[PDB]
Design a protein around this nucleic acid. Structure first.
Length: 1146
RNA sequence: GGCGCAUAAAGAUGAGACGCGUUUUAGAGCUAGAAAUAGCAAGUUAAAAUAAGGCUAGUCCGUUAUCAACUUGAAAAAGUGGCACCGAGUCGGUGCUU
DNA sequence: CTAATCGCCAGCG
DNA sequence: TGCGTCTGGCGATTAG
DNA sequence: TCTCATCTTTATGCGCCTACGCA
């Protein structure tokens, strides 16, 4: 009794099948536990397993970073108040208390309602004086009177709370405050344009006044200020309205300059650097320092509060209780911004910032890896390249390798004098000094060398000496200096780390040395290449690479030679399952899929009677391309850039050159791919800044999940942040269409990028689906499952060998199984049911077993029979929902009872709050409740929804929690928890999956016979054949003679919808729509039948479109029947069941 | 199947920062009216919060991953279900033998 | 009169 | 003995 | 949206190792 297992791995499914030698699938009677009458189920050992897609940890990281900046901002304002507190309480000792409780309603305050001055007349006079805050900042900068302390605090707090960016470094008329003057100018232009437009629309269009200046739901002015209208929607609304009137020339000029009715705080203010606010702050401090003494006492503290920023290599200032921290302290105290550099050790933390990320040597797992631009690494690579070259000459019968003196003189002569060398320069420049040069034929290499001592060239250029770099006694010192130039990339600590070596070099070369910068880490450690030795040689690895007798062994032949003592040192140098899976590296989605398929194959081993299988057949997703297209997809970027530059008009490369290694940043590759212009406005682009402009995806990240070069476009700052969540509008198309079509001719961009560029010529969304992230995940997951199944299954070590092959792991390609499917007409359609996962897993097993055994033409009847079985165990994995508490938006107040509060003492009837929480799992309770006016105990049995916010408070103590919810006399033994996708069997074989708390989902499958899916696959793809046509007219007339089949297919849906669907309105509507289309060609009828099949899929209900009639979705919104149905508890494969009957509870 | 070098594409993990947006309050609305209301004036800013919160009280942590039931175990983790044969509308029946 | 049913809506550069 | 790898929540509305 | 750093996988070109069943 020997069997084999076929798997099929995807990103949302795992298909498993168990075959015998004759390609059968056995059936077995399994015992079912519980409290029902039936005690045995016959089931077939074939199935699939479906689950929700595992997601990445990016959004959690973004919200985790966003959580810290709010606490740091509150701490900044707390530091400012702690400075001001004493002199603030000297004059008005309720001011910060009034500022802290301004959010509360008029009766929840404990003080006067006006926050600044308390009384009414002072607040009214203050707001009549300064209409904004920028008037106050300009007045405090310019004037020289002793201002009130509260206005000074308000100006300083507004400067500190919003402070600007930090991209530039160092430092950077009638007034000294240009920003406040610019905002005051914008405010005055707004006022003048408003009164002019008001008078003009009063004159020329008296009927359209209320729609503009009074409606709050439209996109007029009253919708621009109070409603939810942006600037672009308001401009697009108002532009034809004043284009139709007369006397609006300057307003159209301003609207074409985007300076009409503008606000102060808007979206494109992000370009303001913090030096402007710093100048305004220093100005008002130097102005008012004479009156108040304590402003002059600690001006530098207040200026330090604004400019302080935690460096990116230090990290979160923890105290040994975080999970992401690496900071180390020199003391134990509180880290204010004033004593930062007197507490935290910057050097050790900056070293641990880098060292915690890098790899280990994969051959010596305790040593750290060498830098990439190190000297020993470059020597190793260039000798490993040189010690396998072969030359043939005039007196050469059999070819030979080089000599140790020859390889010494070669690296002494031409490698140490050129950046990159060629094969022609090696044949000419060296062999001109050699007599034996006549018929040189050099094999094993290509036209140029792919290894270079470029760090040696930069060091001889800097230090201007060869005697220091030629010696060996300096050697380790050189290693150390490269380490410093890889670790600390901030030129304040490099001087402290490098002061020990300036006693050997000059001062000018020391000043020119610290501007050097390297990056990248290698793949091997220095204890592998110079630490270990051989037994009796006295030679290291690199000593063998300098000279190796006659063999000229390379690195792999060195560390795999059994005649030496390297393999034994590697072998003498070289836990839980879920811990090892957590110890893997990669995306968590393939971690989920790997864990599921390992649990499935382990459980299948456990089912079959503890016997290990013979073969395990998996299908991978790697290919074997051709050399032409493979090298065309491997050609560099300086090919394509120079080709397009040669094709079109070009003057940018006259004074701005570009090599093939300097072009790797995405803010320069797009600058040269777009010929030095902004792609949303015809204007000249700069390279002197090259960072202040922004890269933007054409289709936004909200709708799609791609960030490739076919979607990224480098634009200006205001153009990217002008649009938010849409393809750019038809004005951008009508302006830049000719320029984009000119750039399309040079083949800089593709047709898909230009298709995404003008999606607005069709709509904001035409349709999604096929994304190459799944193509990454499938390849990763099949490589991992092959490695871990070979590691886990075969355990017994052989004595003189590695192990004993008790079970083989075979890996196949999809081309072979698709060829087998296309040969013998075993077709498949993805849009009928979910049986195709189990079916192609079975096909993988059959093809792999037959290809190993035989090389088959007699027995196809058993394959055609098992490809039409009605019973396939489909299991949807029950999960417990975790994530956000509710929707993120904040709804305004209403008198409803489904508004979750935002804080503890903020009642939602007067403050508003969140809404629609996410239900983690449900429970089945039974108790007695007071029935309102009767108020006596009446028996109930219903479903509760435990949200994510209340999960801990439920699991702490359930009885008092749901007692305070409004229940009494409950049975704690009779509480059943129910996660998502819990399975209920109702009457007549109708299955339902519990969606959240009052919603269900369709559970049954559709078993369609093989003749119908064969005729339906041939009915589609009619005009195509994917090749040359022969013997397909018989297939065409076979489709033509079987139209009646299609009518039967409608019957095959209809009675099924009478059994488990119960959605009769959509059913007879769509059969009427089918009866109104009994005359079309067969191709369109099949193309719409495959759209009709989404009525009876598994899972959530959906909406679709038959011909032009759109059928909307019938949702299931009642859970008062699954209280009296059979609850199923399924295993990981669905072979082990536990059936609870809920009708006998009570 | 697995390494080392060069080129290119697709991504992943972590740290530091900006700019908005949303919600309540504050910015005394005037006139004619019993009024349901109508005419008129006005609008650009600020405070606070930005997952409820938690204890380990940090300028820290709180949306990723693990998760069927049953019997043990504090958890970690372990254990729990007979075989052939004829057939097939979501699995049925037959004989062995427990 | 309370439970189906329709239609809208969902933090971002 | 050699050789290839999108779906639930919610208000407004209707039907019973 | 900006700045910084480190990793994986895939395909070509060059050199090289081995497991193991297949011709």
């Amino acid at each position: 009794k020997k069997y084999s297992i076929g798997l099929d791995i995807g990103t949302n499914s795992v298909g498993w099948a168990v075959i015998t030698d004759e390609y059968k699938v056995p059936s077995k009677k399994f015992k079912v536990l519980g409290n029902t009458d039936r005690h045995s189920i016959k089931k077939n050992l074939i199935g699939a397993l479906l689950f929700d897609s595992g997601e990445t940890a990016e959004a959690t990281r973004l919200k985790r970073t966003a959580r810290r900046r709010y606490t740091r901002r509150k701490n900044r304002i707390c530091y400012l108040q702690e400075i001001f507190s004493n002199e603030m309480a000297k004059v008005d000792d309720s001011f910060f208390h009034r500022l802290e409780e301004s959010f509360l309603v008029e009766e929840d305050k404990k003080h006067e309602r006006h926050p600044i001055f308390g009384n009414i007349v002072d607040e009214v006079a203050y707001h009549e004086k300064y209409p904004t805050i920028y008037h106050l900042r300009k007045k405090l900068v310019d004037s020289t009177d002793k201002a009130d302390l509260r206005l000074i605090y308000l100006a300083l707090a507004h400067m500190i709370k919003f402070r600007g960016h930090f991209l530039i470094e160092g430092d950077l008329e009638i007034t000294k405050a240009p920003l406040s003057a610019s905002m005051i100018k914008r405010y005055d232009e707004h006022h003048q344009d408003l009164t002019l437009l008001k008078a003009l629309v009063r004159q020329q269009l008296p009927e359209k006044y209320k729609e503009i200046f009074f409606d709050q739901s439209k996109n007029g002015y009253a919708g621009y200020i109070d409603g939810g209208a942006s600037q672009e929607e308001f401009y697009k609304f108002i532009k034809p309205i004043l284009e139709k009137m007369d006397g609006t020339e300057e307003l159209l000029v301003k609207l074409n300059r985007e300076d009409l009715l503008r606000k102060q705080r808007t979206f494109d203010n992000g370009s303001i650097p913090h030096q402007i606010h710093l100048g305004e702050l220093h100005a008002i401090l130097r102005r008012q320092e004479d009156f108040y003494p304590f402003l002059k006492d600690n001006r530098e503290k207040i200026e330090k509060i604004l400019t302080f920023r935690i460096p990116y290599y230090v990290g979160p200032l923890a105290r040994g209780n975080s999970r992401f921290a690496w900071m180390t302290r020199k003391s134990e105290e509180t880290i204010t911004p004033w004593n930062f550099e007197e507490v935290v050790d910057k050097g050790a933390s900056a070293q641990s910032f880098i060292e915690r990320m890098t790899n280990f040597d994969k051959n010596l797992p305790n040593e750290k890896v060498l830098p990439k631009h190190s000297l020993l690494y470059e020597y190793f690579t260039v000798y490993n390249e040189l010690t396998k070259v072969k030359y043939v000459t005039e007196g050469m019968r059999k070819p030979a390798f080089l000599s140790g003196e020859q390889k010494k003189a070669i690296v002494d002569l031409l490698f140490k004098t050129n950046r990159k060398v060629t094969v022609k320069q090696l044949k000419e420049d060296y062999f001109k000094k050699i007599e034996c040069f006549d018929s040189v034929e050099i094999s094993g290499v290509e036209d140029r060398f792919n290894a270079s001592l470029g760090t040696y060239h930069d060091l001889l250029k800097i230090i201007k000496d060869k005697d220091f770099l030629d010696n060996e006694e300096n050697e380790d010192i050189l290693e150390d200096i490269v380490l410093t130039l890889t670790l600390f990339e901030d030129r304040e600590m490099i001087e402290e780390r490098l002061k020990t070596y300036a006693h050997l070099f000059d001062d000018k070369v020391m000043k020119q040395l610290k501007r050097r910068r390297y990056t990248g880490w290698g793949r091997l450690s220095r204890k592998l290449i110079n630490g270990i030795r051989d037994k009796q040689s006295g030679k290291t690895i690199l000593d063998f690479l300098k000279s190796d007798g006659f063999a000229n062994r390379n690195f792999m032949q060195l560390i795999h030679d059994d005649s030496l003592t390297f393999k034994e040192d590697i072998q003498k140098a070289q836990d839980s399952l879920h811990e090892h899976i957590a110890n893997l590296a990669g995306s968590p989605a393939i971690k989920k899929g790997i864990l599921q398929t390992v649990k499935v194959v382990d459980e299948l081993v456990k089912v079959m009677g503890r016997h290990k299988p013979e073969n395990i057949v998996i299908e991978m997703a790697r290919e074997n391309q051709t050399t032409q297209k493979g090298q065309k997809n491997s050609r560099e970027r300086m090919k394509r850039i120079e080709e397009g530059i040669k094709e079109l008009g070009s003057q940018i490369l006259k004074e701005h050159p570009v090599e093939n290694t300097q072009l790797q940043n995405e803010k320069l590759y797009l600058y040269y791919l777009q010929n030095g212009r902004d792609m949303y406005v015809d204007q000249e682009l700069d390279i002197n800044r090259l960072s202040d402009y922004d890269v933007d995806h054409i289709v936004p990240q909200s709708f799609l999940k791609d960030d490739s070069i076919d979607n990224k476009v480098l634009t200006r700052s205001d153009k990217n942040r002008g649009k938010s969540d849409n393809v750019p509008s038809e004005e951008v198309v009508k302006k830049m269409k000719n320029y984009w079509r000119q750039l399309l001719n040079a083949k800089l961009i593709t047709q898909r990028k230009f298709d995404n560029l003008t999606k607005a010529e069709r709509g904001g969304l035409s349709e999604a689906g096929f994304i190459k992230r799944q193509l990454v995940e499938t390849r990763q997951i099949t490589k991992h499952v092959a490695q871990i199944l070979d590691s886990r299954m075969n355990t017994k070590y052989d004595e003189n060998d590695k192990l004993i092959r008790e079970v083989k792991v075979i890996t196949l390609k999809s081309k072979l199984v698709s060829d087998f499917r296309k040969d013998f007409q075993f077709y498949k359609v993805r849009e009928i049911n979910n049986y195709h996962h189990a079916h192609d897993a079975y096909l993988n097993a059959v093809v792999g077993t037959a290809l190993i055994k035989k090389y088959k033409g007699r027995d196809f009847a058993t394959v055609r029979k098992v490809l039409s079985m009605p019973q396939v165990n489909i299991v949807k994995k029950t999960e417990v929902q975790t994530g956000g508490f509710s929707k993120e938006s904040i709804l305004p107040k209403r008198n409803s009872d489904k508004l979750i509060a935002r804080k503890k003492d903020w009642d939602p009837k007067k403050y508003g709050g969140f809404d629609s929480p996410t239900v983690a799992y449900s429970v089945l309770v039974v108790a007695k409740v007071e029935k309102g006016k009767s108020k006596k105990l009446k028996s109930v049995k219903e479903l509760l929804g435990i949200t994510i916010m209340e999960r801990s408070s439920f699991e702490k103590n359930p009885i008092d929690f749901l007692e305070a919810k409004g229940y009494k006399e409950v049975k704690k033994d009779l509480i059943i928890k129910l996660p998502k996708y819990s399975l209920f069997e109702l009457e007549n074989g109708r299955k339902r999956m519990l969606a959240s708390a009052g919603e269900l989902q369709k559970g049954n499958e559709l078993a369609l016979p093989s003749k119908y899916v064969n005729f339906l696959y041939l009915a589609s793809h009619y005009e195509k054949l994917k090749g040359s046509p022969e013997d397909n007219e018989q297939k065409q007339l076979f489709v033509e003679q079987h139209k009646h089949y299609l009518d039967e297919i409608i019957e095959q849906i209809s009675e099924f919808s009478k059994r488990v669907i119960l959605a009769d309105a959509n059913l007879d509507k769509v059969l009427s729509a089918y009866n109104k289309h009994r005359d079309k060609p067969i191709r369109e009828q099949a193309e719409n039948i495959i759209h009709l099949f989404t009525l009876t899929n598994l899972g959530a209900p959906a909406a679709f479109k038959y011909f032009d009639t759109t059928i909307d979705r019938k949702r299931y919104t009642s859970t008062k029947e699954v209280l009296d149905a059979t609850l199923i508890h399924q295993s990981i494969t669905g072979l082990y069941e536990t059936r609870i009957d809920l009708s006998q509870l009570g």
